[PDB]
Design a protein around this nucleic acid. Structure first.
Ligand SMILES: Nc1ccn([C@@H]2O[C@H](COP(=O)(O)OP(=O)(O)OP(=O)(O)O)[C@@H](O)[C@H]2O)c(=O)n1
Ligand SMILES: [Mn+2]
Length: 580
DNA sequence: CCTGACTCC
DNA sequence: TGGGAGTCAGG
């Protein structure tokens, strides 16, 4: 706890060295259009704090920020890059991101600030953010001297921690994963978040007004069927109605009371007309609260754009998550909800939305990894395995498969390969539990390689204490040797699933990097808007569609070469809804 | 603030 | 008693 630094009133030449740890501090969780409260720079010449009004209106500091040959080490550089974009400033030359480094070394640590990263190497000369800024309503930027010291201590930590973190990544064979995949991706996500997605608020509001009326009609029907008014959105009050007043069978309990999950209620549909109406009500209510109202709340009124934040250092598998708003869970399965997608439109006139999705990429990845002959065969003969399962499940022909049936058969394929039980399967399909068990048996017998892979991957996790993905991402599984059956089982199924979902995540990230480079090298105006796990969404002038119809799927397909091919479907249209 | 509901991959 | 996420209203 002893560290000298300069509290600078102006920018000097020595603050602009070609190598520096840089902190650009943004305290609000949502960094879009959020205040930069201070800057700190640490380099061979010393340690510096600058006020943002000083630094960010200085033409030399702005120049240095934007000079890719001036290298910066940071923590959460995407947060800084995006905040700086909202201030009209370009940040380049980020060569090390401690957040992403810590994330690759162990995603379970939940590293979310520099102090937490520091603890991984027993570096303790830096405070946690929460201790400096406080919590909830008490959250505040502290007095300049305290803030200055905090930002400089963070910068010093990044400075000292870079080499030890790189060394450990290197020992793990994850240095290139960080430097050639996650760090370049961070810059691409920053562009996408800043660009935002344009929303047709006129249409969304009209939808919302019509939905409110429809919701009211269903709400009354429900009260009529119940013989009484009650809060449908309280599973507690609903439970009394269904299971006490109406005396319907109790199929499941939670720790707080009776279950009213969709799975359960669907099973009660033959007992009383009220259950179907409740399900419908809860769907419509979620549309209203989340995809109409919640979405309008986050629309930037002046531009009509929404700006998601893609969390790149959160999930345990290597996936992204999307927040405020989550643009990776916009409805599609039911037509009622799918219409929400009509409100997502191109950011200018005569542009179009272009959507491309990998076909069954998880399962191709698994065919490659397991080297299963049959499954590989199905993808080398390139069939549609989900539809095939559907033909089997509903004892119907190819042309006889309805989009809902395939979706049910897709969940069954995913279920079985990832360790669903006979109980779980029998429930989902309403067959005898013996039938369910026989079906799983027939399944693994039809794909013995997948069978062997899943047995082997579990024993490997027991022995090493972690599993890996195709590009060397890691997940530690300390619970896999637990004496407790449930605990051990959950860990075992993580060993079965994480390597595949995580590998699929590795591949699409690589494709995003490849695609962006091809787009920029052709000076196309087309740019990425969103990633939805196995899908990439772009917008571009209508004139560019032809080029995109070739380039996007080709780049995606070539991102990696597996034993089986990768296949991508694509569509475009005037709205996200129409890109189908 | 947690639980359980709905949404997606 | 398949895996990974976020947001919401209610309590
Ligand atoms: N119930 C589900 C749905 C999806 N996924 C994961 O998310 C991936 C992509 O989702 P999805 O597009 O629905 O799977 P696809 O096989 O590609 O089906 P489709 O071609 O119809 O889009 C899956 O491969 C799987 O790894 C999952 O684990 N469980
Ligand atoms: Mn898909």
């Amino acid at each position: 706890a002893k560290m000298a630094f300069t509290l600078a009133d102006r920018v000097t030449e020595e603050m602009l060295a070609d190598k520096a740890a840089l902190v650009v501090e943004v305290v609000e969780e949502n960094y879009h259009d959020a205040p930069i409260v201070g800057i700190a720079v640490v380099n061979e010449h010393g340690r510096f704090f600058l006020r943002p009004e000083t630094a960010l209106a200085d033409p030399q500091f702005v120049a240095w920020l934007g000079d890719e040959t001036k290298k910066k080490s940071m923590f959460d550089s995407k947060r800084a890059a995006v905040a700086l974009k909202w201030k009209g400033i370009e940040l380049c030359g980020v060569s090390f991101d401690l957040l992403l480094a810590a994330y690759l070394l162990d995603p379970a640590q939940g590293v979310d600030d520099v102090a937490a990263a520091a603890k991984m190497k027993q570096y303790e000369a830096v405070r946690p953010d929460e201790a400096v800024y406080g919590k909830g309503a008490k959250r505040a930027v502290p007095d300049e001297p305290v803030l200055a010291e905090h930002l400089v201590r963070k910068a010093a930590a990044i400075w000292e921690l870079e080499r030890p973190f790189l060394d450990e990544l290197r020992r793990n064979e994850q240095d290139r994963l960080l430097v050639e995949l996650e760090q370049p991706l961070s810059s691409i996500l920053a562009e996408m978040e800043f660009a935002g997605v344009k929303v047709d608020t006129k249409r969304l509001e009209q939808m919302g007004k019509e939905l409110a009326e429809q919701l009211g009609t269903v709400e009354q029907r429900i009260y009529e069927l119940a013989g009484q008014e009650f809060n449908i959105n309280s599973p507690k009050q609903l439970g009394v109605i269904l299971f006490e007043k109406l005396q319907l069978p109790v199929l499941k309990k939670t720790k707080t009371g009776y279950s009213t999950s969709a799975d359960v209620l669907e099973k009660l549909a033959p007992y009383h007309e009220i259950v179907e109406n409740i399900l419908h009500y809860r769907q419509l209510g979620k549309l209203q609260s989340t995809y109409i109202e919640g979405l309008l709340k986050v629309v930037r009124p002046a531009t009509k754009k929404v700006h998601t934040i893609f969390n790149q250092a959160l999930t345990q598998t290597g996936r992204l998550s999307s927040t405020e708003p989550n643009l990776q869970n916009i409805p599609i399965r039911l037509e009622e909800g799918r219409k929400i997608r009509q409100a997502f439109v191109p950011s200018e006139s005569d542009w179009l939305i272009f959507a491309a999705d990998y076909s069954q990429i998880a399962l191709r990845v698994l065919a490659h990894i397991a080297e299963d002959d049959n499954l590989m065969e199905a993808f080398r003969r390139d069939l549609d395995i989900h539809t095939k399962t559907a033909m089997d499940i509903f004892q119907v022909s190819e042309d006889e498969v309805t989009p809902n049936m395939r979706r049910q058969a897709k969940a069954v394929n995913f279920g079985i390969v990832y360790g669903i039980s006979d109980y779980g399967l029998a429930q989902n399909l309403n067959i005898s539990r013996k039938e369910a068990a026989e079906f799983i048996e027939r399944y693994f017998e039809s794909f013995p390689g997948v069978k062997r892979y899943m047995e082997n991957i579990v024993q490997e996790a027991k022995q090493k204490g972690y599993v890996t993905t195709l590009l060397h991402r890691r997940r530690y599984l300390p619970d896999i040797t637990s004496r407790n059956f449930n605990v051990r089982s959950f860990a075992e199924r993580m060993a079965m699933n994480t390597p595949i979902q995580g590998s699929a995540a590795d591949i699409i990230k690589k494709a995003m990097i490849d695609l962006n480079a091809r787009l920029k090298e052709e000076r196309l105006q087309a740019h990425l808007l969103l990633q939805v796990h196995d899908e990439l969404i772009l917008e571009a002038p209508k004139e560019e569609m032809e080029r995109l119809c070739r380039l996007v799927p080709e780049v995606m397909e070539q991102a990696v070469t597996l034993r089986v091919p990768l296949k991508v479907d694509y569509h475009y249209g005037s709205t996200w809804y129409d890109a189908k």
